[PDB]
Amino acid sequence: FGKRKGEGFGVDKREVEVLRRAEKLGLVTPGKTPEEQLKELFLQGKVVLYDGRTGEPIEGPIVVGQMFIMKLYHMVEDKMHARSTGPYSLITQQPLG
Amino acid sequence: YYITQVRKEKKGAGLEFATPEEALAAHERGEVALNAPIKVAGRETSVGRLKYVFANPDEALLAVAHGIVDLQDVVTVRYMGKRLETSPGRILFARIVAEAVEDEKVAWELIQLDVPQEKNSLKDLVYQAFLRLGMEKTARLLDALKYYGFTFSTTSG
Amino acid sequence: MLDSKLKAPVFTVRTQGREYGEFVLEPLERGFGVTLGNPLRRILLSSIPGTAVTSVYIEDVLHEFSTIPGVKEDVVEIILNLKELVVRFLNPSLQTVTLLLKAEGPKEVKARDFLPVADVEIMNPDLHIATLEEGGRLNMEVRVDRGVGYVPAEKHGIKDRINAIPVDAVFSPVRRVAFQVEDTRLGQRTDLDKLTLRIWTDGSVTPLEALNQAVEILREHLTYFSNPQ
Amino acid sequence: MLDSKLKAPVFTVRTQGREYGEFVLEPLERGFGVTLGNPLRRILLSSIPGTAVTSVYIEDVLHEFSTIPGVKEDVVEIILNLKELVVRFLNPSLQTVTLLLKAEGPKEVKARDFLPVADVEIMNPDLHIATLEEGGRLNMEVRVDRGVGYVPAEKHGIKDRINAIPVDAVFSPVRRVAFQVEDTRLGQRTDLDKLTLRIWTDGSVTPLEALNQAVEILREHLTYFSNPQ
Amino acid sequence: DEVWDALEEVIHGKVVLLNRAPTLHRLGIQAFQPVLVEGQSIQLHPLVCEAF
Amino acid sequence: ERVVRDSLAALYAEEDGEVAKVDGNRIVVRYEDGRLVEYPLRRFYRSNQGTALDQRPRVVVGQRVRKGDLLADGPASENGFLALGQNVLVAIMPFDGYNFEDAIVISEELLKRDFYTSIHIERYEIEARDTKLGPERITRDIPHLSEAALRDLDEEGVVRIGAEVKPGDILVGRTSFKGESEPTPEERLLRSIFGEKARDVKDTSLRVPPGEGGIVVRTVRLRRGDPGVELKPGVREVVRVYVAQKRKLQVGDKLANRHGNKGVVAKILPVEDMPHLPDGTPVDVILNPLGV
Amino acid sequence: AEPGIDKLFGMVDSKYRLTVVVAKRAQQLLRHGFKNTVLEPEERPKMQTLEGLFDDPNAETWAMKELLTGRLVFGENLVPEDRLQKEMERIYPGE
């Protein structure tokens, strides 16, 4: 947020609608200025996210971050199997592949 | 759930408005001051319930779109032949179902918009929808709930 | 033109009365239904001028929370019924028309009792305002304007007469704007949306009329990006 | 002009190179920064034409999983380090161009090595490709295509020479976009939406040409609302 | 790709069954009208996961 | 740290020295004692459970190494640290059911950047048995209907390197003898109407199974003149084909965090419209709170 | 779910008979050629690559849309066992 005051802008007309529903909730101390209002809301770990579809925001801070996500290995079972017709056992005449 | 609920807040000045007349003046202005909330304990009516009164069920929702009313904020709204006091959101829910089964009169005989919708309440809205209404039409309501369900919830934040 | 080009949006329409209308449109490229939908939605509820009773003054009533003798309704319930009123003005010269009314004796005052102003017409005739009784007097004025959206009484607090009472501003002819982007399939690719938005309107402007108005404002707005400074 | 229309958003820009640019545009009617900061932010992120490595070729390589003897990298760390490259064609007719390169000895081949082509300017002069040791032979062709969106190589699979290898390939130049509807103040009413966009980019295409194609497609789209059905 | 438009027809109206791992009750095998999808993955519905 | 050096994967440096050669395959290091050892590196070797073990040098030409410091990173060692995944920014809220119960949404962007790619290797095999109905050849011949399907085979028999074998394609050609011991009446007249002279043999060629198959990478053979092998009786020669593929991150996969959020991907979202930070940056993953 | 399944379930003495009716009725709708239908002209069964369903899609989407409209008749032993198929094969062409 430091760069905000530098790069050349201030809090949206969105960056506040959230704070109300925030103070009403009970996360940010009422009264305290918007600026110091977001920090107290950032230090809880959450930040003001906007919906990537409506431009409109998400009424209410949504904790975000950097989590270490590994991709889990696949077993031969996970492979998809589809059997219309096919081979057939010797003795026990029940299908097989 | 979220949508169907009502906040509660601060209590500094002793209010129980249901009686006095100068309990509106110095109180309503006090909502304009930092003393009287919109969700306050004055049992009958909190200053917030005095500020907004919407004619048609719809007006009840434009007010939420225009930064004027929260969905979880107490409000006075006149539905079918009665001065109702409920959140703008409870009056929405009351419609989702009312639309899942066009019949808007039966679509009110089975929903308790008197409280937050837990998992046990709905279950009921359904079992009862099934019984009363129809089975096919019901399923319609069942996703009709699976929609808003998955909707608000994302902006719920 | 044949394939991809003539595969341009199939703008289907279904307009019932001056209130219901369902405009379909597709195919559209991945996530575009959701790209056009919203704008038209935040527009149809924010920049569409209209007519509505914003200011109301009463005979002897000076405060918003009171009741009049020989009047079933109350000061907050009568001015409510007015919020349900729908009129109309002709040219730009009009910015605010105060309607006049005065009735007495056993009568059910309706939006027809006012005095017929020239450039203004009430789309809301048989609108029930109140039921008068014996010894009951009623005389009010209703300032009608042309804003855009929903304006709080407190927000403007009109100041006609000194005892006048503000009315919440309901300037959006449209009651609600719905839209969905169901999935559709056309040939090779199927990841195409099918943008559909329904629009509810009091009858002031036809749903489809609003549309045209809508898209316009949004278009006349893209030119705003023209003189590099 | 004097007022209202001379109060029309003052479009101002800000650019050094083609890598960045901010685009203020105030004042604006209540809640428009949204109704415009968004559609755009979307179109900008995908619907703008660019150019990226499509098919690669290696002197003595068969499959994309081999290791050129003499080069530090693996072929899978060389065709991945190409996707980082950014070319800038000059005229439509250049849907495709091929850029050779022929090096040896202990040198750090850089994108500045590609043997030049008329019409094309590599704005990526210092990007690292491979690292050749004593006696290396890294002779390679590399196709560059103009396109749009993101298309798995697996999706197009182009084969120049049989030994050639295809690569995944994103086409959007834009690398970031955002908007900040800061409430600006100017006397009469302060609910002033001061919309301002800021588009970053590889360079392939400027920021202003972008914010233009953007607002163009969308104007080119609001058009499919004409003939109902 | 023309065949794919035929499978898109040999399934109209038709349905298929889907059984859970430990089928515990009738509700563990439910019909479903097929919709052709993309991927190595059967797409289920949120409301049924409660059944199986 | 103590995991990548102890678990053997990343090739460390013994005694101090300078870096002499640096191939994608050899790192002959120069010890400050006149010595210069050649440090071979497994290019793209196959693991038992299929994952890869491709190593990559992390040292420039002519570097003065520090006794005990990685010269090449093991398979999943970022740089000496046990790296089994990526750091992606995670937003954590509920999405229109896409993350319904324990399912995860992935930002399309994640693939725009070669992030979650993995290089797995499958080993297809097959034998030329010596059946009493005649020896099972391994020729570039597939009796009945085409040549359009012979391309990849290129070399007579086995498939040519660098050929993405699409599932259903011939990986190796083979021929067995049709009947149990006899020819056939109806199939006798038939073959004669269009050329009685027809290889009355069969096509039992090793093909790729339904599922997948990528670009060949290596083919082995143990035909006659067996070097130092042990083929089995009934086996004339064993041909091996190794296929590899870049398995990007598609729906169905299960990515998980070291705490238990064991989930499976249910929707790749085009960056265009997924939750974004006040400025330009969006989120790549998304997680439901209902599980915590 | 299924259009008027409610009435359907609501027109039989057994949820199981409504299952037997449609299936068996689905048979003879394909068996004796697709023209044993008690309705067709205007608004009746329709698919969408063209309007094709007019010919032969899901046999039982008919059996079900037929019985919904009070035209069919089913009982415990309504019409005799062998002559039934005999005459039905006499009135309907298409093989």
Do the beta carbons of residue F29 and residue F88 sit within 8 Å? Answer: no
Residues of C in contact with F270 (CB under 8 A): 30-31
Angle between helices B90-100 and B135-155 (to 10 degrees): 150
Domain annotation for chain C: domains and CATH numbers: 1-49+172-225 (3.30.1360.10), 50-171 (2.170.120.12)
F96, F272, F274, F276, best to mutate vs chain C, most C CBs in 10 Å:
F272
Give the CATH number, domain containing residue G40: 3.90.940.10
Question: End-to-end distance of chain B based on CA atoms, in angstroms?
Answer: 13
Look at the block and give the residue holding tokens 């304006």: C151
- Residues with Cβ within 8 Å of G57's Cβ and at least 6 positions away in sequence, in order, are E12, E13, G45, G47
- Kindly state the helix (H) or strand (E) to which residue E32 belongs, with its residue range: strand E29-32
D152–chain C Cβ distance below 8 A for any pair: no
CA D202 vs CA D45, D79, D172: distances in Å: 13, 18, 9
Copy the structure tokens of residue C162. Answer: 């000194």
**Structural domain tally of chain G?**
1
| Subunits close to F (at least 3 CB pairs below 8 A) | A, B, C, D, E
Residues of E in contact with B142 (CB under 8 A): 47
B101 CB-side CA count, 13 A? 28
Amino acid making up residue F249? L
- Kindly state the helix (H) or strand (E) to which residue D110 belongs, with its residue range: none
- What distance in Å separates the CA atoms of residue C120 and residue F47, rounded to the nearest whole number? 84
Look at the block and give the residue holding tokens 């110095």: B26
- Residues with Cβ within 8 Å of A86's Cβ and at least 6 positions away in sequence, in order, are A95, A96, A97
Do the beta carbons of residue B112 and residue B4 sit within 8 Å? Answer: no
G5, G9, G15, G64, best to mutate vs chain B, most B CBs in 10 Å:
G5
Copy the structure tokens of residue F288. Answer: 């439901």
Copy the structure tokens of residue D198. Answer: 């800021």
B144–chain C Cβ distance below 8 A for any pair: no
Give the range of the structural domain holding residue B121, as residue numbers without chain letter: 1-157
Angle between helices B119-132 and B90-100 (to 10 degrees): 30
- What distance in Å separates the CA atoms of residue F180 and residue F133, rounded to the nearest whole number? 8
**Cis previous bond, D207, omega within 30:** no
CB-based contact B68 C150, cutoff 8 Å: yes
Q: What sections of chain C are H helices per DSSP?
A: 33-43, 75-81, 153-156, 207-219
CB-based contact A79 E41, cutoff 8 Å: no
Q: Write b or e for each residue in B85-110: b if 16 or more Cβ atoms lie within 10 A of its Cβ, otherwise e.
A: ebbbbbbbbbbbbbebbeeeeebeeb
CA D36 vs CA D22, D41, D169: distances in Å: 15, 8, 29
- What distance in Å separates the CA atoms of residue E23 and residue E25, rounded to the nearest whole number? 6
Amino acid making up residue C129? I
CB-based contact F254 A72, cutoff 8 Å: yes
What resolution, expressed in A, was reported for this entry?
3.3
Among the listed residues A27, A49, A25, the one whose alpha carbon sits nearest the alpha carbon of residue A37: A27
- What distance in Å separates the CA atoms of residue B82 and residue F257, rounded to the nearest whole number? 54
Among the listed residues F160, C137, A48, the one whose alpha carbon sits nearest the alpha carbon of residue D181: A48
CA dihedral F156, F159, F161, F167 (to 10 degrees): 160
Give the CATH number, domain containing residue B131: 1.10.274.100
As a whole number of Å, the CA-based R_g of chain B is 17
Do the beta carbons of residue B29 and residue B51 sit within 8 Å? Answer: no
Among the listed residues G91, G93, G88, the one whose alpha carbon sits nearest the alpha carbon of residue G25: G88
Over chain F, what HEC string results?
CHHHHHCCCCECCCCCEEECCCCCCECCEEECCCCEECCECCCCCECCCCCECCCEECCCCCCECCCCCCCEECCCECCCCECCCEEEEEECCCCCCCCCCCEEEEECHHHHCCCCCCEEEEEEEEEEEEECCEECECCCCCCCCCCCCCHHHCCCCECCCCCECCCCCECECCEECCCCCCCCCHHHHHHHHCCCCCCCCEECCCECCCCCCCEEEEEEECCCCCCCCCCCCCEEEEEEEEEEEECCCCCCCEEEECCCCCCEEEEEECHHHCCECCCCCECCEECCCCCC
Residue in A24, A31, A62 nearest the CB of B157: A62
- Residues with Cβ within 8 Å of D119's Cβ and at least 6 positions away in sequence, in order, are D89, D90, D91, D94, D97
Residue in C65, C81, C200 nearest the CB of B24: C65
B8, B155, B156, best to mutate vs chain A, most A CBs in 10 Å:
B155
Closest chain G residue to the Cα of B138, Cα to Cα: G1
Chains G+A touching (3+ CB pairs under 8 Å): no
CB-based contact F273 C31, cutoff 8 Å: yes
Strands C52-57, C165-166: pairing is antiparallel
- What distance in Å separates the CA atoms of residue E19 and residue F264, rounded to the nearest whole number? 20
Closest chain F residue to the Cα of E38, Cα to Cα: F251
CB-based contact F273 C30, cutoff 8 Å: no
Could you tell me which residues are beta bridge partners of residue C137?
C104
Copy the structure tokens of residue F164. Answer: 């993405």
Q: What sections of C97-183 are H helices per DSSP?
A: 153-156
CB-based contact A59 B67, cutoff 8 Å: no
Give the range of the structural domain holding residue G32, as residue numbers without chain letter: 1-95
Looking at CA atoms only, how far is residue E37 from chain A in angstroms?
14
The pair phi, psi for residue A84, each rounded to 5°, is: -75, -65
C180–chain A Cβ distance below 8 A for any pair: no
Q: Judged by CB atoms within 8 Å, which residues 2-31 of E form the interface with G?
A: 5, 9, 12-14
Do the beta carbons of residue B156 and residue B2 sit within 8 Å? Answer: yes
Angle between helices D34-45 and D207-221 (to 10 degrees): 110
**Structural domain tally of chain B?**
1
Among the listed residues D212, D214, D208, D179, the one whose alpha carbon sits nearest the alpha carbon of residue D195: D179
Hey, how many other C-beta atoms are within 10 angstroms of the C-beta on A4?
A: 17
3-state SS class at B118: coil
Closest chain D residue to the Cα of A17, Cα to Cα: D31
DSSP state of C224: G
Angle between helices B119-132 and B135-155 (to 10 degrees): 150
Do the beta carbons of residue G63 and residue G29 sit within 8 Å? Answer: yes
A69, A77, A85, best to mutate vs chain F, most F CBs in 10 Å:
A69
Do the beta carbons of residue C193 and residue C33 sit within 8 Å? Answer: yes
Copy the structure tokens of residue F79. Answer: 């740089």
Q: Judged by CB atoms within 8 Å, which residues 143-162 of F form the interface with E?
A: none
The pair phi, psi for residue D101, each rounded to 5°, is: -175, 135
Q: Write b or e for each residue in C82-113: b if 16 or more Cβ atoms lie within 10 A of its Cβ, otherwise e.
A: bbbbbbbbeeeebeebbbebebeeeeebbbee
Q: What sections of D9-141 are H helices per DSSP?
A: 34-45
- What distance in Å separates the CA atoms of residue B31 and residue B35, rounded to the nearest whole number? 6
Do the beta carbons of residue D195 and residue D36 sit within 8 Å? Answer: yes
